[PDB]
């Protein structure tokens, strides 16, 4: 029973970035957090000493999974996850609102 997986479009209900929607680049289960595309912009330093040119690049800092919710392919609204077995004889996770299959 897991919540968020890599590649899905998700919504944020909490924080400075709350309300924005975006795909997930990477999911780490060690620190329990997710990374949303083009979200929570922070400064990163990649320098070049020989070329004398330092380069500062924006990057997406990992966000807590509790502040992030999945988006249903049909309803398009943010919703909680539920585990069900469809009539096709499959084990799947679907929205608590509609019957659309998330996977």
């Amino acid at each position: 029973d897991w919540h968020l997986f890599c590649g899905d479009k998700v919504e944020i209900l909490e924080g400075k970035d709350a309300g924005k929607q975006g795909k997930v680049v990477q999911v780490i289960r060690q620190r329990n957090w997710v990374v949303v595309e083009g979200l929570n912009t922070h400064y990163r330093y990649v320098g070049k000493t020989v070329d004398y040119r330092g380069t500062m690049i924006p990057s997406e800092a990992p966000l807590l999974h509790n502040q992030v919710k999945l988006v249903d392919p049909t309803d398009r609204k943010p919703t909680d996850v539920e585990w069900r077995f469809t009539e096709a004889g499959e084990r799947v996770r679907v929205s608590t609102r509609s019957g659309r299959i998330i996977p």
Partner: protein, 161 residues
Amino acid sequence: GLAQRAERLKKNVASQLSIRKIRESDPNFKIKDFPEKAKDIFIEAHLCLNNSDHDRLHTLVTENCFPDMVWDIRYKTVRWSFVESLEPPQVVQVRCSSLMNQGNIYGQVTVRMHTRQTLAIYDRFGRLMYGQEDVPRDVLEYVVFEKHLVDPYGSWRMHGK
């Protein structure tokens, strides 16, 4: 003078090609509304340089061309300097050119303006004076406004030169 410039902006190959890219991709935009809005963002930019606001400068104003001026102002912070600048006036607003990139969904528009700048700099405790107070310098500037397309919000971010 202004008419010839306008003809060089509208009727020239590369420029009108970039305009074609914009209009075809996003018909909801407008060419004539660009210089004034970019002017406003420029004023806000200089005001951010004066008020020393890093967040708004990074998010709104500059993208990837910032670390030069940022390291400048932050080194000025290391030397503990007070930077006070004012640049309200404007004479003639005319854009320069445009350069775009397809694959990375990137864009740039070079725009030049005429502004009267007043730059005053104080240093540390001993008040080491750099620049001049209340002196209307005449400055001609070239700023390239970049456009990037993401899902949550459109990105308009200036580039100093």
